[PDB]
Structure 1
Amino acid sequence: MENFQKVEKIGEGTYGVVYKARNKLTGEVVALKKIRTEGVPSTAIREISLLKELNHPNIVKLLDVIHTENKLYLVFEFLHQDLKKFMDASALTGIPLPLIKSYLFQLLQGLAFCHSHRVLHRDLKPQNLLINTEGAIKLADFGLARAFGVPVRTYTHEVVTLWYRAPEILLGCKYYSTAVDIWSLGCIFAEMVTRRALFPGDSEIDQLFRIFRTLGTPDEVVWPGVTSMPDYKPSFPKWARQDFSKVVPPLDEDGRSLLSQMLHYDPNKRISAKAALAHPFFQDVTKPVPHLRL
């Protein structure tokens, strides 16, 4: 828009392009998402307007909502780096456990807050986890999937990330819960520890099978009702579960137990963000500052 001067493109997703920009008035630097026939549905406007009211230190604040020329622009507070880039930069030495623990603890506080308001992210990935020089980490794009809806692709010709998708979504459940975000965060937690994606599928079935090969093929014993799910197939191969000690070495037992509860198949057995915050793993949590090269 006229009140904003674009500085550089910092993102490309399903909702559209993201640019770092400067507010001609306030002089502030912000992240600007122009959002991707009709002209923006009323339901989307009210939903986003409500999300704008959510304030939490671990959630990227939605500063302004601009509906102009039948177009939609979202103005978010700006952070200089995302977790994806930070991990790539730390791929050689790895992120120190205390920092991993701090980030996980903060992310859970963010989810706990959002979940308490019945708001979910649904498409969590390292790319939408933003960090700053002070040691904070924030979740970006919470509530947008529901506000707008899940499209088929993007305009930059890209697709969402199946790597962090919960099994109930993959199996066709259409009324999934906040538990899907916990699953995604568990996948991200494992990635920070090992420096490699946990379940990097190349298709929906490969995603599901990679999960099955590691956690074992689910059945009625561990997940009641699983065989009645929309996309469940009796013909799925039956794989045995692996020990977490081989999945996320050298994470200690506290971390492994917490990870195990975040990766439970049954959404109703999967730990909530609120309960996770009380896990023994966080007994000695602190807030270290990262070595951030901007």
Structure 2
Amino acid sequence: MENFQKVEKIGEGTYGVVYKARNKLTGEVVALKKIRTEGVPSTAIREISLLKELNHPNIVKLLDVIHTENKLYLVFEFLHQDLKKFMDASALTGIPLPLIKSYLFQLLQGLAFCHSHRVLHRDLKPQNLLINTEGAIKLADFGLARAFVTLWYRAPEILLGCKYYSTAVDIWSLGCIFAEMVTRRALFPGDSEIDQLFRIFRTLGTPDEVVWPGVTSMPDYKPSFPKWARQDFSKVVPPLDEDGRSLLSQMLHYDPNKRISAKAALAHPFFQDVTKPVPHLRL
């Protein structure tokens, strides 16, 4: 678009590339996202116009939606750094737990907000979680999935062929990120759909009708699925204290219906002593 001067590519999103750009008129720096050709379906337009409404302190604000020359651009407020870069930058000493807890609390609030509006993210990952110098973290790419690649944070029901998943898939994704921040290593680093699923099974044990009633008749479930035993969280996420492990385990429940909500999670004892530390980031 003419009213923007790309400064650089800051990422390769799902539905198009993201650029840091400066508005030629206002002068403000922003994050410009180019979408994707039939001319941009109507349904897409409206889904996008709704996302322009749900504003929350923990959600990257969608400033303007530009549909020019049958092209689609989303203009989002610009954030200082993504969670991924900050995580890598903290691989030596690790993110202070008080900061980890603050980031989780905020993210859960964002999801809580989105879920109450029946809007799901569906593709949460360290790359689309954004942070700023003020101690804040926000969700980006929200609602775009519906409107319109790592498998590490994908919920088991999505891997098993379930077509009408719920908001609980986001809760699962967040739990995987929560653990990653704590251990400084990906929880389930799969490299193909079956490897992802089996990595989950190996750590949490293969699901059955007991822990997940109905799992055995899901579209892609195979009874030939190996039978792995469930590992203890003390081995999976040290040095996470008990309240943390207790919370993580509920975020990682197989049955999407037993999986903790963002709402309930915010009331978990893990957040009783939550503060809002400021990060030491290099821009």
Query: Deviations along 1:250-288, whole A, 9 cap, x unmatched?
Result: 100000000000000000000000000000000000000
Which of 235, 258, 261 is the equivalent residue of 1:246?
A: 235
Query: Deviations along 1:81-115, whole A, 9 cap, x unmatched?
Result: 00000000000000000000000000000000000
Residue pair 1:33, 1:73 contacting (<8 A) in 2 also: yes
Residue pair 1:214, 1:241 contacting (<8 A) in 2 also: yes
Query: Deviations along 1:180-226, whole A, 9 cap, x unmatched?
Result: 00000000000000000000001100000000000000000000100
Aligned length: 283
Deviation at 1:24, TM superposition (A): 1.4
Residue pair 1:83, 1:129 contacting (<8 A) in 2 also: yes
Q: Distance in 1 between matches of 2:141 and 2:10?
A: 14
Alignment pair present for 1:279 and 2:273: no
1:153 paired residue number: none
Query: Deviations along 1:7-45, whole A, 9 cap, x unmatched?
Result: 111111321111101111211110000100410000000
Q: Distance in 2 between matches of 1:173 and 1:282?
A: 32
Which consecutive segments of 4 or more residues in structure 1 shift more than 4 A?
A: none
1:98 paired residue number: 98
Q: Distance in 1 between matches of 2:13 and 2:121?
A: 15
Query: Deviations along 1:150-197, whole A, 9 cap, x unmatched?
Result: xxxxxxxxxx22000000000000000000000000000000000000
After TM superposition, the score normalised by the length of structure 2 is: 0.99
Q: Distance in 2 between matches of 1:188 and 1:11?
A: 19
**Secondary structure, aligned partner of 1:11:** strand
Q: Distance in 2 between matches of 1:37 and 1:66?
A: 16
Structure 1 unpaired stretches of 5+: 149-159
Deviation at 1:80, TM superposition (A): 1.6
Alignment pair present for 1:237 and 2:234: no
After TM superposition, the score normalised by the length of structure 1 is: 0.96
**Secondary structure, aligned partner of 1:164:** coil
Query: Deviations along 1:124-173, whole A, 9 cap, x unmatched?
Result: 1000000000000000010000101xxxxxxxxxxx22000000000000
Q: Distance in 1 between matches of 2:133 and 2:173?
A: 25
